């Protein structure tokens, strides 16, 4: 059973533990946001805005720093900074949850504002570190370990996304179960301890996987941040894969979510918790099946053809969504159609995203991958920021139809731009 010691499985374990810690972290942040502060749209809105803006402005420099330094060093640097930030913030959660009642009651004033600024800043640092580590490990290490065998690379990406989805659906359940059985303070203590132990394990694990893959080793004073930012963006514009990334960034502006807890608008309206649980489970299962579908389609049709098929599937499913919303309380039929539509739009979106990830990992000169992926994430979060602004501009329940129409339109635009890329790079169907 040498598969247990092969760098493949070791890397899957590393990504799995990192994602598990991150998902516990995000669920705990949401529990803080809701238990202390009421279900207020603007708190979550400003949280998302701060995170998205910081990653937007820092993606190019993060990618440049990833590319310039050694893969090993940047890998554990990002890992350690992420884990220390999450541990410190888990300690802060311990203190605040142990002070929930009297913070709400005895001493009003700026204490809530101070704790919320601290939570958002440390969460933003943690998410920046998560973006850095995701870029470096996924892109560079996956492409190098997979080598020139592109089927193995596709399997790598697909199984990574499956692990991501299974974590996203299980970790919130585990954190909720333990927190209910104990107390929020116990939940936060457990999360902090688990992040610590996972930090140690993943440090050792990255050291191990580095050994087994020798190919990784071969590889105003603020003027230089702007020069690097401009150089990275212009390099990304010249990259022939620009259209696919642009369309993916468009696809990340959809309002039909049910993806995670930090990003959601059904809860913004106020839907019941059981329905959200069922929708999240269906979305996770459908995303896993979508990864399977992308694996199956890449072998039969071309990679660009696979992306195009995913695009048509996703677009037609959102056509089903817009038919559902356009139909004349509300009948159960319309809501059921909208729910099935978002669930199958999920499979379309994930097949498309795996395809675009494959293109990005494939068509880079390998001297520039970090910067290209960093600006890719910056664009993704830029259109996520516009998504957040659009949500902010329409709190009213009597705007959901317009919001859905806008999201479908932007999805269509993204797939049209990917279609332009397909025409450019094939000229054959």
């Amino acid at each position, epitope marked *: 059973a040498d598969y247990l010691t092969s760098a493949k499985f070791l890397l899957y374990l590393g990504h799995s533990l990192s994602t598990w810690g991150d998902r516990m972290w995000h669920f705990a942040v949401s529990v803080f946001l809701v238990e202390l502060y009421g279900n207020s749209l603007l708190l979550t809105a400003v949280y998302g805005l701060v995170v998205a803006g910081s990653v937007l402005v820092l993606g190019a420099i993060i990618g440049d720093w990833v590319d310039k330094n050694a893969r090993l060093k940047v890998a554990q640097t990002s890992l350690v900074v992420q884990n220390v930030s999450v541990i410190l913030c888990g300690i802060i959660l311990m203190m605040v949850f142990l002070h929930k009642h009297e913070l709400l009651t005895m001493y009003h004033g700026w204490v809530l504002t101070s704790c919320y600024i601290l939570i958002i800043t440390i969460a933003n640092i943690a998410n920046l570190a998560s973006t850095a580590t995701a870029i470096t490990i996924q892109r560079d290490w996956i492409v190098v370990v997979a080598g020139e065998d592109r089927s193995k690379l596709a399997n790598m990406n697909a199984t990574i996304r499956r692990i991501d989805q299974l974590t996203n659906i299980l970790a919130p359940m585990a954190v909720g179960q333990i927190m209910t059985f104990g107390s929020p303070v116990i939940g936060c203590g457990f999360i902090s301890g688990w992040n610590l132990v996972s930090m140690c394990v993943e440090y050792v694990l990255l050291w191990k996987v580095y050994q087994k893959t020798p190919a990784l080793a071969v590889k105003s004073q603020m003027a230089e941040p702007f020069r690097t930012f401009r150089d990275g963006w212009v390099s990304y514009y010249n990259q022939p894969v620009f259209l696919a990334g642009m369309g993916l960034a468009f696809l990340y502006m959809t309002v039909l979510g049910f993806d995670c807890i930090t990003t959601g608008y059904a809860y913004t309206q106020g839907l019941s*918790g059981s329905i959200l649980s069922i929708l999240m489970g269906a979305s996770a299962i459908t995303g896993i099946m979508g990864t399977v579908a992308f694996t199956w389609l890449r072998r039969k049709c071309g990679l660009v053809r696979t992306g195009l098929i995913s695009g048509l599937a996703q677009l037609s499913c959102l056509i089903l969504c817009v038919i559902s919303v356009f139909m004349p309380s509300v009948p159960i039929i319309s809501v059921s159609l909208l729910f099935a539509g978002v669930i199958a739009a999920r499979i379309g979106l994930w097949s498309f995203d795996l395809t675009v990830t494959q293109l990005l990992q494939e068509n880079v000169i390998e001297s520039e991958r970090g910067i290209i992926n960093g600006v890719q994430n910056s664009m993704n979060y830029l259109l996520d920021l516009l998504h957040f602004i659009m949500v902010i501009l329409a709190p009213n329940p009597e705007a959901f139809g317009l919001l859905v129409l806008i999201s479908v339109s932007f999805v269509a635009m993204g797939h049209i731009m990917y279609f332009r890329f397909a025409q450019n790079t094939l000229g054959n169907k």
Partner: nanobody
Amino acid sequence: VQLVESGGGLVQAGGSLRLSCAASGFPVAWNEMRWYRQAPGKEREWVAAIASIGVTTYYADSVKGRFTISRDNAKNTVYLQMNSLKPEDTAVYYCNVKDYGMAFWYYDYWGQGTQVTVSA
């Protein structure tokens, strides 16, 4: 997200009466609302149920038919119309919400309670 209900009191047996639950922080069309009875000397019992998504009711077996429940999204409230009130109906009514919260973090929220008594 505190909720308040009013309209309790005393009516002759076999009469009719109407409790009105007014809710503020949460929708009363996207969350399962139910009613419970708190009779003296015994623990609480289930009255009726409105589903979260559809307008379908799940009245209790013992009191089925003779109770009616209806939600109103415009006024942001839910109603119970009572008919043919019997002496065993004397109890304290609790307006509640089940399964409100996160995708995987949700609770049950309760009202202050109103006294409804039946005399013969």
